[PDB]
Structure formats: C-alpha cells, structure tokens
Design a binder for this molecule. Structure first.
Ligand SMILES: *[C@@H]1O[C@H](CO)[C@@H](O[C@@H]2O[C@H](CO)[C@@H](O)[C@H](O)[C@H]2NC(C)=O)[C@H](O)[C@H]1NC(C)=O
Ligand SMILES: *[C@@H]1O[C@H](CO)[C@@H](O[C@@H]2O[C@H](CO)[C@@H](O)[C@H](O)[C@H]2NC(C)=O)[C@H](O)[C@H]1NC(C)=O
Ligand SMILES: [Mg+2]
Lengths: 507, 512
C-alpha cells in the first residue's frame, strides 16, 4: 500500500535494476531463440552510468530468461546507449571465420555516450549474442556531436543502411556502408511530423500492405520530451525509400500508440518467416518512469506487435492508410492453461445486473468486447451516458480500472486513478483520465470491437482489430489483483453487449 | 453544490442558451466596434435546431453587449452553421448603394445545414451588422455534400495588373480537405485548390482559415502565410483541437514550408479559432476561439448559458525552437485585453528574489478575475534525484471553500508545467471522465544560459489561460468551482527547500 509490488507475467521486466529501451532485437533461427536487449542500469532502479545492454531470450515472446548485463561502455563514465543488431550472413565485416554459423553472425551497432561525445561503435558476438567484442580501438562514426544516437541498421539490396538520430536538430541521418566500418552520409531527413524536443530512436522498415501495391516503407521516430500528452511518444511516417532518401507519401502525423506509456519502439532485425514485421516498445513515459512505484525493477516492456499497413480511415466517407498492430503472444498455451468466462446478447440494464467473478484471480487477463449503442429517449447531450466495465480487484475492490465508452464524447475512456498507491496521486503527469477515439468496425451495424490485455500494472487496448492502440500502466496495491469485472450503465437498455469473453491467464 | 454559477467577466458568454464557435468576426472602423458572432441556441443550454448566429459588440474586446439572435436559417429543422464576414469595400457584391459606408459593407458567408444538405449561403447587412438579409433564396456554393462547411473568406490583392479576388477556405470535412475557391463577386465561386490530408487529420477537418501574418525574423521575410485547421473529433487529448501550418499562398495554392504539425493551443478547451476579417492597423492578425471541448461542452455545469469564448490573441510568427541547438518557426500568441483599464481599476501584488522554503497571498475583495506573471528558476539540491516529485506548485485556493483549488506549477523530473483542475466539489468534474484533471505543457526557458522560465496566466472565473516564453506556447482550460467561490488565496509550495527560486510574481486582480 505504498509500492505496487505486482510484477507483470507476460510483459518482460528486468529481474532487478532500471530498464529503459529495447535494443539489439534479433532472431536466432538455428536455436529458434528471440533476443531482446535493453538499456539497463543494474546498480539501481533509476537511470545511471555505467549503462549496459541487458539481455534476455525467449522461445515464444511470452516467457523471458533475463541474463542481465552483456554489452558495456568500457568505463564508469560512459553509456552503451541505444542501438541495434544485424546478421552479417555474407561476413561483410569480416569478423567471422567459417566456424560461426551464418545465422548467428550477430553484429551490434550502438551509441557510446561519454562526456560530451555520442558516437557509433560496432561490436560482434562470436557466441550467438551472449558476449561481445569491440571492433577496433575507436568508433566507426563520430561527427563531434553531443546528440548523435540510436543507430538502426538494415541490409538494403547491396549495402548496409543506418538510420541515426541527430536528435537536437530533429534529423534522422541515413548512412551507407559496405562493411559496417566505413560509413558515408547519404541523406538528412529533418523537421517532419510531431517534432517535440528531440528525435530519438529512428528505425526504417519495409512493411506488408493489405490493400482493398504489396509493401510500403515506414520510418519510426520516437519523441522525448515534448509529446502531446507530455513526455515521450512514438510517431511514424508512411512512404518510400529510394536507396538514399526517405520520401513520405503525405504530410500527416501518425502516432503508433494513443496511450501515455509507449516509447522507443524497435523492430526485430529478422523474424522466422522473413516477411512479418515485429517490434516491441518500452512501456513507460520519461516524465514519471523513474518514480514508478515498483521494486526491485522499474521499467516494463510492451507486448511484441505485428505491424501491417492497412487501408483505413477514421470515418466512412474517406480513404487513408494506417499501421495496424496485432499482438504477438503464445495464445495456444496461454488459453489452454487458462479459464474463460463469457456473455452474449446482453442488453445492459440496472434490473438485469451482470458481472464476472474470476476464479483464483491471477492479475493477467485478456478480453474481447463487442458492443453497440442502441440509444434511449432519455439520453441527450447534457448527461454522461456511459457503458462502463469496472475491473475491480480481489483484496480491495476500491482499486479498479474503469474502462468503457460514452456517446456524448463519442469515445472510449480509461480511468486509472482509483488506487491507494500514493504515486498515482502525487505525480501530476500520471494522468488519471485517458481517451481514445475508437472507430466502429462496420458502419451499417455500428459495432465496436475492443480487445484488451491486463498484466498486473499494464493494460493495452486494441480497437478495431488493431487500427487504434492505447497502452498505459496502472498500479494496484501489492497483491491486489483484478478478480471481478462489473458491467454498468445509468441508462437501461441504452447499450447492448453482443459478446464479452474474458480469459484469465494462469501464470 | 451541483452547478457552478460563476460567469466569466473578461471572456464573452451569452446571456442564456448554448454558444458554440466564433463567427463573422469583423471590425467596424467607422464606429470602432468589434463584431463577434456565435453559433447559438437560445431555446436551451444544449446544441439544437434551429441554430442561429448570436451577435455581440465590443469597444475594447473586453466588455461585450449581447444582442441575441441575428442571422437565422429561416426554418425550424434547419441550422445556420459557421461562417465568416467580409467588408465589401468596393461593392463587388452589387448589394450596397452609396448611402452604405464602404467600411460597413458587411457580407456574411455561412453554411446552411438543413436535412442532409450543407451548402454555403451569403447574407448581407445594411445597418452595420445587426440585421441581415439572405441573398437569392438559393446557395452560392453547393456540391451535394453532407459535410461541406465553415467558409472563411479574405481578399487577395492581385499583383501586376490582375484584378484581385475573394478567397474562400472551406472544409470538406470527412475527407480532411480545406478547399480554396475564388470569386470576383462573392456569388460565382470556382475551385482553385484542394489542401488535403495534412497534419493531424483526426476525424474531420473543421473551421479553416487562411491568413497572412507578420514575421519577426532573427535567424541565420517580412511575412508568411498561416493556415488554421480545427479537428474534431480526434484530438490527441480527445475531442477538439486547433492546428496550424506555416507556408505561402501563391494565389491558388497553400504550400507549407515543412510537414510539421503545430498545435495553436496545448490545452483542452481551445477550438474553432476564427481570425477577424480586418484589424485597425490593417496588418495585425487577431483571433478568437471557443473555450471548451466538444466531448463535454454541452454538459458543463453553468446556467443559463453554456459556452464561453477565449481572449482574442495577436498572432505573429517568430523564430523559435524547443532546444537551444536548432532552428524552427512558431506562431507566437499575445493576449489582447484592455490592460490599461483593467489594471488601473484593479489591485496589484508582487514578490521578488524569493527562494522557496517551508509564503502565501490573500486577495483583497476577491473578484475571481486576475492576471499573474511568473519568472522562476531551478537551483538543484542534494536531495533531488530521478525518483521523486520535486515540484514548484502554486495553489490558487477559493475564498468560501478552499478545498477547491487550482494547482499549477513546474516539475524538474518531468521537465514540464502542470495544471490540476480536479480539486472541486462540482460533481460534473468527477462524473465526466473526458474532463481531464491533469494537463501538461513542455514549456521552454526564455534564455538558455540563465534557465529562467516565464509564465503569464489569466484566470477569469471558470477559465484559465497560460502563455509560456512570451507566448510561444499557450494552454487554455476550463475549471469549475462551486457557486460563489472565486479564487481567494495563492500559496507557493515545494517539498525541497531552496530547490526553486521565484524571481518575480506580479498578481493583479481585476475589479470589474
Ligand atoms: C478533395 O480531395 C479529397 C481527397 O483526395 C477528395 O476526397 C474523396 O471523396 C470521395 C467522395 O466523393 C471519397 O469516396 C474518397 O475516398 C475521397 N478521397 C480521399 C483520399 O479521402 C475530394 O473529393 C476532393 N474534393 C474536390 C472538390 O475536389
Ligand atoms: C541535417 O539537417 C539539419 C537541419 O538543417 C542540420 O541542422 C543544423 O545544425 C547546426 C549545427 O550542426 C545548427 O546550428 C542548425 O540550427 C541546424 N539547423 C536546423 C534547421 O535546426 C544538421 O546540421 C544536418 N546534419 C548533417 C550531418 O547534414
Ligand atoms: Mg457547428
């Protein structure tokens, strides 16, 4: 009842220490292992030097083995700031004698921050990405810059292309290299979208496109500080990449996530089928991430997501384009081992009150919800006319997430202030109220689809099969856990729930 | 305890009924009268039809006389939606005999919304903007659309010997389009360009307006063009929002200088900004906005009026960037009030060289309307690290009940300014979950070697505006105290002593 010592079970967290950004994401196809590195301060639960890349491995992006610090700066003064991994199949670096399986030639491209210089180094691994050896005595790219970070490198066919943030000038620099050693400047993408205070963590990616062409390039650009809710946010651009220059199709601003706690998204260098685009993000915000009431670890990661470009618009009378997000979890094992509750053709009304009590609550559930607004004569514009689901919890049912929809605001809401944890009341950037403008799925029926995941301190809401997504953290009291889901509305028969599956995860 | 009956004193509110976006703003240079029109329902405090244009007049953009319903749709079901006003000096409309002063030849260009149709009509006034007459018993720009609204018109002086034209900016809303039509005579219109899918599209483009704005260049021209586009639904905070683009107008096309997204106001309750057709200086650009959010506006706890307007602001383009290592360009906003009259009819307070340690201000004969200025700086402290809330807060408490208060300040770990507007007894503020309690803005320093933050606030009963870095950043929000409970005391607090230093703090209550 001062800290919130409930730890996620399907979002990766460090065993201990401060975790702050996904790094070196790659997939080892011989061992069938997913590798997730992260910025890590092992000494404490706030950002500090020396900063390493923590390292964790998963068979299924659901269960993580955290091996702790792996890649390091080389002195207490410095940081192994963010960066990426690549698989040098053809041995362009020349680091790899025949004895290293081509599928495991992991080379890491990363920012050294020391004093006033941020410059990019490379370090190859000769043990499948568990330890690393620094290439030479020096960096491979130094521009006498203090803000020069977050290299994300891919193979373009062919050369290596690097995207780096010259953060303070709002620039993604693009650099090419034959061998990962000699880098030459190629184009300077600058002053696009929502600029905030800095550009951080760029990553350029080719993404499938389910039309109604085959693919499209996408540039991710993270922003901190200066995001529209406060602090950090992640935006993206849709366009094409000519080998040197990135050209956005349009002049639109697009956020990946409409919640306050989603930042520093990075994509896996590779996936098993070599087409799908997966990526993960740090699940917090820089305004309050180091004061989060968790111990002995601090930051959490989001779920992995699959990104595909879809034709979509926010109303039925126009045409636009949007990055759909589908969640990647091991749902076979999670749903087999877990207990499901459900509702159908339920017209919400005070007389027929309905609720779901969860047997042996675990704090980790998913749900699909399908609802419609029937309207009522008694609803008009000067009343709050909401369909609320209170996710109440087992030991203190005064701590709850309140989530739902209201006509007169035409939107979905998340209330995350109802908790005894002091932090949520004391830190004034942890907003109680969050909103998302969720489209219907079918404009002749006006059916709303929400799919959500709850894991102890974090909730992710995917609207309209993943066209809109909102990720936020909550903090219940310790060992308080969601055990009752309660359905309410002050207007009888005003709403109707077609479908409402819950599935508690037993973990 | 349920309804917050405190009416704003320097912001415009109708006598009674529901008020919505600003419309037909112009300046009468003959009588020196500012004319404001508003989306209006007099029959209730919620939107409904028939919607009229309410009319207000003011000498100083500070005190307004409300004249009620002036422009109407002519039918019960229908609605007289947003539009703008032009002064047809050289009588290009063919409506004005010479007994009508040129400075007074007022033509309203507005949207008629009736059943499934939304089309642009024009009406005109022969008594300087109080009564109006519809022209032709038909629209002047129809495109059988259901989402075709909010025409904002200005005059484009032709160069070389080309005559010059009226330019209309309209919203083809659902397709995120500002269409630019020209006309010689405000009657026959022709499509010139289709500005589409820019910035923050949200759900709909609404209330567009093209303007040319002075430019204070201190970089490495004289003017630049600005395009205002309002978005609702789909603002990032939820509901409504106003963005702007910076660029050039070549006579048919607006062309932005980048693909940046710039919000005019970072608060939750600043929407549908319209600029005045004309100003006294013929070069300054003034704008007014509707001070609420569509998500909760028709639920606000006020009677017998529902919406308020913001202060008029003076918009000027300056060189600005959010860090000291880059260049960019920003729309600076500068409040426009009758400060001479207000401050001299009113009571001042000061505080200097103050370093915060475990001071309060009692306002004498509280009026509830006040301005304040604040310069502060952060000093550091052994006891402040990344895992604490090290805030400098200012609690504007209430006289009758002081458990209702605004809490605004800065915090170092979040590097940003906050406003907490939840602390009140008014049920609406707890019941409506779209009425955010906590608002934030990433306010810059005003000098990067002194690290001094500058903040100018205006707090009229139930509405607060904040300007940062001399108006490079603005955040506007409504708040609701109990009936007859205006701001009485401001207490300055910080949990870390000597961490912050308030160099200046000039409060000035308005006795209006
Ligand atoms: C202005 O441009 C927009 C966007 O290109 C046009 O919008 C299209 O309108 C039709 C209906 O007539 C829709 O079915 C399309 O989906 C819209 N396109 C897009 C991209 O959203 C609009 O018609 C244009 N208006 C004029 C007057 O030219
Ligand atoms: C990439 O483009 C940006 C944008 O023009 C360049 O930014 C300038 O950098 C200097 C110092 O390096 C600053 O004083 C200027 O203010 C920056 N300009 C702007 C508009 O912010 C940047 O230098 C370019 N970098 C490379 C490597 O080409
Ligand atoms: Mg309207």
């Amino acid at each position: 009842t001062t800290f919130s010592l409930n730890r996620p079970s399907v979002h990766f967290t460090p065993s201990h220490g401060w975790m702050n950004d996904p790094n070196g994401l790659w997939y080892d196809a011989k061992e069938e292992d997913w590798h997730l590195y992260y910025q890590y301060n092992p000494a404490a639960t706030i950002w500090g030097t020396p900063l390493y890349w923590g390292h964790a491995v998963s068979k299924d992006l659901t269960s993580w083995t955290d091996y702790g610090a792996s890649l390091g700066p080389g002195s207490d003064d410095a940081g192994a700031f963010s960066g990426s991994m690549v698989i040098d199949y053809n041995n362009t670096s020349g680091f790899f004698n025949s004895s290293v399986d081509p599928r495991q030639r992991a080379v890491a491209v990363w920012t050294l921050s020391k004093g006033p210089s941020q410059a990019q180094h490379i370090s190859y691994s000769l043990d499948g990405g568990y330890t690393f050896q620094h290439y030479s005595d020096n960096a491979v790219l130094d521009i006498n810059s203090s803000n020069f970070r977050d290299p994300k490198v891919f193979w373009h066919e062919g050369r290596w292309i690097m995207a780096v943030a010259e953060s303070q000038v709002f620039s993604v620099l693009f650099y090419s290299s034959p061998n990962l050693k000699n880098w030459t400047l190629e184009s300077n993408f600058t002053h696009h979208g929502w600029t905030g205070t800095q550009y951080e963590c760029p990553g350029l990616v080719k993404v499938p496109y389910d039309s109604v062409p085959d693919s499209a390039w996408v540039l991710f650009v993270s922003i901190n500080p200066g995001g529209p809710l406060g602090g950090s946010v992640t935006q993206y651009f849709v366009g094409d990449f000519n080998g040197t220059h990135f050209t956005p199709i349009d002049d639109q601003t697009r956020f990946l996530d409409m919640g306050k706690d989603y930042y520093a998204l990075q994509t896996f260098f590779n996936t098993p089928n070599e087409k799908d685009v997966y990526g993960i993000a740090w699940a917090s915000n820089w305004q309050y991430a180091q004061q989060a009431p968790t111990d002995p670890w601090r930051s959490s990661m989001s779920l992995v997501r699959q990104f595909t470009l879809k034709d979509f618009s926010t109303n039925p009378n126009s045409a636009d384009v949007v990055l759909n997000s589908q969640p990647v979890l091991n749902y076979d094992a999670l749903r087999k081992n877990g207990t499901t509750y459900s509702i159908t053709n339920y017209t919400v009304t005070s007389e027929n009150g309905k609720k779901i009590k969860l047997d042996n609550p675990s704090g980790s559930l998913e749900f699909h919800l399908e609802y419609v607004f029937n309207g009522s004569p008694d609803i008009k514009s000067n009343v709050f006319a909401d369909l609320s689901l209170y996710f109440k919890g087992n030991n203190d049912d005064n701590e709850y997430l309140r989530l739902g929809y209201e006509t007169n605001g035409g939107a979905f809401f998340l209330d995350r202030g109802h908790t005894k944890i002091p932090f949520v009341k004391e830190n004034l950037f942890f907003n109680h109220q969050l909103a998302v403008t969720n489209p219907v799925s079918n404009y002749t029926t006006n059916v709303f689809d929400v799919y959500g995941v709850i894991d102890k301190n974090i909730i992710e809401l995917y609207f309209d099969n993943g066209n809109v997504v909102s990720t936020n953290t909550f903090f219940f009291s310790t060992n308080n856990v969601i055990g009752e889901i309660d359905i309410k509305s002050p207007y009888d028969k005003a709403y109707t729930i077609n479908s409402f599956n819950v599935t508690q995860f037993n973990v």
